[PDB]
Design a protein around this ligand. Structure first.
Ligand SMILES: Cc1cc(=O)c(O)cn1-c1ccc(-c2nnn[nH]2)cc1
Ligand SMILES: [Mn+2]
Ligand SMILES: [Mn+2]
Length: 175
């Protein structure tokens, strides 16, 4: 599969490993569920980039569940903030809130609504592969440069996928 090859070449090995381990532990094969594999890599990378454009942020996504819940409980005890029912992706020590991050092949408002419906006062920030984004109360958290880097990376993934005739498949597999 070109899609499998694509993932191993455009994402750094730690992201690939993490994505692979996550999938294999739940009995899903990345050579079969290849569009899922790429989406998980893409989401992971956006979480890591967002964290790097701050020690403003604590990365929760990409840890195993013990560590993620350990990080969340330690943040809840020492700030007073409410425990989420689901692990979010980051904590913002400046604004003193958890963040859920979304990356969508469809319209940002549509995906924003789905996330909001699955959730507390977790802040939501959605990115598209088109440079559109949406966030709770239109508070975009990061400065424009950091946001522009994420969008560029996301647009570039799309374009790479399009080069290899993978983007049409990838687009229609979110649902
Ligand atoms: C795994 C995951 C964590 C998140 O925080 C988040 O926003 C999205 N995902 C995620 C990413 C992609 C999928 C998916 N499943 N099938 N195709 N894509 C399911 C979940
Ligand atoms: Mn997550
Ligand atoms: Mn997320």
């Amino acid at each position: 599969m070109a899609m499998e090859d694509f993932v191993r070449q455009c994402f750094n090995p730690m992201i690939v490993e993490l994505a692979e381990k996550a999938m294999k532990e739940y009995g899903e094969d990345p050579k079969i569920e290849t569009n899922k594999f790429a989406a998980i890599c893409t989401h992971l990378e956006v979480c890591f980039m967002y964290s790097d454009f701050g020690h403003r942020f604590e990365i929760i996504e990409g840890r195993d569940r013990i560590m993620a819940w350990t990080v969340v409980n330690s943040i809840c005890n020492t700030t007073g903030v409410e425990k989420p029912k689901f692990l979010p992706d980051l904590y913002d020590y400046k604004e003193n809130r958890f963040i859920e991050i979304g990356v969508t092949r469809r319209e940002v408002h549509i995906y924003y609504l789905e996330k909001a419906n699955k959730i507390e006062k977790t802040h939501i920030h959605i990115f598209s592969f088109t440079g559109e984004e949406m966030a709770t109360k239109a508070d975009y958290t990061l400065d424009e440069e950091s946001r522009a880097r994420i969008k560029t990376r996301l647009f570039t993934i799309r374009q790479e996928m399009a080069s290899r005739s993978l983007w049409d498949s990838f687009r229609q597999s979110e649902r």
